[PDB]
Amino acid sequence: KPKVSLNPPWNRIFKGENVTLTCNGNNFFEVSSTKWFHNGSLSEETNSSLNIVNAKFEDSGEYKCQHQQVNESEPVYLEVFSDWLLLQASAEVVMEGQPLFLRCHGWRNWDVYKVIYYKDGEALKYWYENHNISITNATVEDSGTYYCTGKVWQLDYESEPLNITVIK
Ligand SMILES: *[C@@H]1O[C@H](CO)[C@@H](O[C@@H]2O[C@H](CO)[C@@H](O[C@H]3O[C@H](CO)[C@@H](O)[C@H](O[C@H]4O[C@H](CO)[C@@H](O)[C@H](O)[C@@H]4O)[C@@H]3O)[C@H](O)[C@H]2NC(C)=O)[C@H](O)[C@H]1NC(C)=O
Ligand SMILES: *[C@@H]1O[C@H](CO)[C@@H](O[C@@H]2O[C@H](CO)[C@@H](O[C@@H]3O[C@H](CO)[C@@H](O)[C@H](O)[C@@H]3O)[C@H](O)[C@H]2NC(C)=O)[C@H](O)[C@H]1NC(C)=O
Ligand SMILES: *[C@@H]1O[C@H](CO)[C@@H](O[C@@H]2O[C@H](CO)[C@@H](O)[C@H](O)[C@H]2NC(C)=O)[C@H](O)[C@H]1NC(C)=O
Ligand SMILES: *[C@@H]1O[C@H](CO)[C@@H](O[C@@H]2O[C@H](CO)[C@@H](O)[C@H](O)[C@H]2NC(C)=O)[C@H](O)[C@H]1NC(C)=O
Ligand SMILES: *[C@@H]1O[C@H](CO)[C@@H](O)[C@H](O)[C@H]1NC(C)=O
Ligand SMILES: *[C@@H]1O[C@H](CO)[C@@H](O)[C@H](O)[C@H]1NC(C)=O
Ligand SMILES: *[C@@H]1O[C@H](CO)[C@@H](O)[C@H](O)[C@H]1NC(C)=O
């Protein structure tokens, strides 16, 4: 029962960024003879850590790994974007009680100001120099559709909305 982890945790990234898919727990552990399936098609890498450089739209997809005598892992979907702002989430579905992290991410990692996170059309938090909103113990009320606004350079921009569910 293998589980694909990501680092950064962000599973929605901008074009050109880099992310690493570890076929297990911590990056302190290593292993050989691992299988990667991007969109179902077997990959050419075997290292348990499958890196991804200058993300191309084609990198968007369903990924999973498997071992010599083990059933393949639950798939993980990575989506690549091109836009001024991207709302990132630790996890899109969360079990009542777990942590939840949202991050208003600016293109090319630039800086964003006058940031405001929105939940269900309502203003929620506001900061000059942006900050990633975080939650330790998650309520079920926190489920909702988020999106953030911010000013980049000197213009205002709105992000794609993102639904989030907290089950119990
Ligand atoms: C595994 O399956 C995935 C399907 O979910 C594949 O991802 C899809 O990949 C295609 C091709 O890169 C991507 O389409 C892109 O190509 C368009 C023309 O080149 C480009 O214009 C699109 O982006 C822009 O245009 C659309 C329409 O106006 C906008 O909606 C976009 O926001 C943007 O402005 C686009 O990038 C698909 O989008 C992408 N699907 C998803 C859900 O992202 C993987 O390629 C496949 N893996 C492999 C290796 O085959
Ligand atoms: C994702 O990882 C890759 C690779 O580690 C990073 O790409 C690197 O990008 C720099 C540009 O910042 C490249 O070097 C620069 O090239 C220009 C022009 O050739 C030169 O003027 C600079 O002085 C510098 O040498 C570098 O080649 C490239 N590395 C590789 C291996 O391709 C990338 O930055 C990472 N993504 C992010 C968002 O950081
Ligand atoms: C092969 O996978 C290992 C992890 O299993 C990757 O190793 C990490 O590499 C960085 C430097 O690139 C080290 O600082 C880390 O300590 C390493 N971690 C471990 C667990 O050894 C390695 O990058 C992968 N190799 C390739 C070419 O993708
Ligand atoms: C996020 O979920 C919301 C509902 O919580 C979706 O919005 C509504 O979806 C229902 C589905 O039939 C429609 O009747 C409403 O008109 C939708 N409202 C709006 C303003 O779109 C929303 O589509 C979901 N978004 C994603 C990305 O799944
Ligand atoms: C492993 O896969 C087999 C079928 O290939 C399935 O019967 C079995 O339940 C799986 N292992 C676990 C722990 O579920
Ligand atoms: C922790 O989570 C449980 C349910 O998941 C809830 O009853 C409790 O109030 C939460 N703690 C806080 C501070 O919200
Ligand atoms: C918030 O964003 C910063 C980028 O400067 C990042 O280093 C940090 O890990 C993020 N914080 C959280 C709680 O994820």
Q: Which technique was used to obtain these atomic coordinates?
A: X-ray
Query: How far is CA 71 from its chain centroid?
Result: 24
The alpha carbon of 126 and the centre of ligand 1 are apart by a number of angstroms equal to 33
The region, left, alpha or beta by phi > 0 then psi within -120 to 50, assigned to residue 140 is: alpha
Domain boundary among 23, 55, 81: 81
Which runs of E-coded beta strand occur in 18-111? Answer: 19-22, 35-38, 41-42, 49-52, 61-63, 65-66, 76-81, 85-89, 93-95, 100-106
Residue nearest to atom 4 of ligand 6 (CA): 97
Resolution rounded to one decimal, in angstroms: 3.2
- What are the residues whose beta carbons fall under 8 Å from the beta carbon of 22, sequence distance 6 or more? 4, 5, 6, 7, 48, 49
- φ and ψ at 28, to 5 degrees? -85, -15
- Confirm or reject: Cβ of 61 under 6 Å from ligand 1: yes
Write out the residue range of the structural domain in which residue 157 sits.
Answer: 82-168
Cβ–Cβ under 8 Å, residues 157 and 130: no
- φ and ψ at 96, to 5 degrees? -40, 125
Ligand 6: nearest atom to the Cα of 168:
5
Cβ–Cβ under 8 Å, residues 81 and 15: yes
Domain boundary among 50, 81, 112: 81
Task: Give the single-character DSSP code of 33.
Answer: S
Cβ–Cβ under 8 Å, residues 66 and 101: no
Tokens 């988020």 appear where?
Answer: 146
Residues near ligand 3 (Cβ within 6 A): 27-30, 47-49, 51
